[PDB]
Design a protein around this ligand. Structure first.
Ligand SMILES: Cc1nc2ccc(C(=O)N[C@]34C[C@H]5C[C@H](C[C@H](C5)C3)C4)cc2n2c(-c3ccccc3Cl)nnc12
Ligand SMILES: [Mg+2]
Ligand SMILES: [Zn+2]
Length: 342
């Protein structure tokens, strides 16, 4: 069995120092997707160690090793919502910790919950969104459609299922107040990854940024966790052009695959899901203008050291504008043929 041997090394070999992973591993300029997938579970352990969670919370190391592997194995392989996404999201959480002084805003246990939630937040994603669950009358919709955020409720339930798996509950020694607290936080944070939810609370996020963060305000803690989570989720937009280009490719591969299924079901996909109608440059520009840039603007507003993240997203949006003309075919196509018009 592969996993048990991967577990045996991961447990008995020792945890690699984060600097050995990459000299810039803790920089906002580092691209975690550069790390070979076979190195990612070790890197998760390294980050947990470097953030001092393992020591602070006295996490059992066999339990933690099993948990991390179980979480990795809990992702399928659609083009975008796979383990490497969850890993890069978690890595960004680690970046926020190393670069922004979260401990001035958040309790230790909240920061811990944020990171674990990042690892788990898209568990068992099938490459389809919430509307598709209802449209296709999936089992997940049958469970959760009356509450909404179907996929995110499922991700959370899957995280819980992993914790409830023997030898995997990294929290089982917690006091009952802390155990209850961690699971409540995981619920809130994972549910916050539904963009419908972000869009609902965006004005509360603005109000908070405008009046200024109040560490004595429990609502401010909740709101900030939501914003940080979303910041991790979209953090591919904060790297270089190449990262944004590739991730747009993975995203639309996934979207158009869903759209193809919708057409087979006799439904009209959303424009952005329809490979015959979607114009990727304007769609990506819309996403960056209406969703990604405001999120990092808020992040910068709350954390002045996050300024570079916003300017990076803004710059990447500019690049989409600059390359948009390449989506128009000028001259003949590469094969010198107009056959494709037929
Ligand atoms: C690069 C990139 N583009 C993205 C373009 C579009 C959408 C997207 O779901 N847009 C919306 C647009 C309106 C209002 C809501 C609900 C629906 C209608 C669909 C959101 C997401 C995009 N996205 C994400 C991402 C983040 C969280 C969950 C799922 C995903 Cl896919 N991560 N990266 C990207
Ligand atoms: Mg998700
Ligand atoms: Zn995600």
């Amino acid at each position: 069995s592969a996993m048990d041997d991967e577990y045996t090394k991961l447990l008995h070999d020792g945890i690699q120092p984060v600097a050995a992973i990459d000299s810039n591993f803790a920089s906002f300029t580092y691209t975690p997707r550069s790390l070979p997938e076979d190195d990612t579970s070790m890197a998760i352990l390294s980050m947990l160690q470097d953030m001092n969670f393992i020591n602070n919370y006295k996490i059992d190391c066999p339990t933690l090793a099993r948990f991390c592997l179980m979480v990795k194995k809990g992702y399928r392989d659609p083009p975008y919502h796979n383990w490497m996404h969850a890993f890069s999201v978690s890595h960004f959480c680690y970046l926020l910790y190393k670069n922004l002084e979260l401990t001035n805003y958040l309790e230790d246990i909240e920061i811990f919950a944020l990171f674990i939630s990042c690892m788990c937040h898209d568990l068992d994603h099938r490459g389809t969104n919430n509307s598709f669950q209802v449209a296709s009358k999936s089992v997940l919709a049958a469970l959760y459609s009356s509450e909404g955020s179907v996929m995110e409720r499922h991700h959370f339930a899957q995280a819980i299922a992993i914790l409830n798996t023997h030898g995997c509950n990294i929290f089982d020694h917690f006091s009952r107040k802390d155990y209850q607290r961690m699971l409540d936080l995981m619920r809130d944070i994972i549910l916050a990854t539904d963009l419908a939810h972000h869009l609902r609370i965006f004005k509360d996020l603005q109000k908070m940024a405008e009046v200024g963060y109040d560490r004595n305000n429990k609502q401010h803690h909740r709101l900030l966790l939501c914003l940080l989570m979303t910041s991790c989720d979209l953090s591919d937009q904060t790297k270089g052009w190449k990262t944004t280009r590739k991730i747009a490719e993975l995203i639309y591969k996934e979207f158009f695959s869903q759209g193809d299924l919708e057409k087979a079901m006799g439904n009209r996909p959303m424009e952005m899901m329809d490979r015959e109608k979607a114009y990727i440059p304007e769609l990506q520009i819309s996403f960056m203008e209406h969703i990604a840039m405001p999120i990092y603007k808020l992040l910068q507003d709350l954390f002045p050291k996050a300024a570079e993240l916003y300017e990076r997203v803004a710059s990447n949006r500019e690049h989409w504008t600059k390359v948009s003309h390449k989506f128009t075919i000028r001259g003949l196509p590469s094969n010198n043929s107009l056959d494709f018009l037929d």
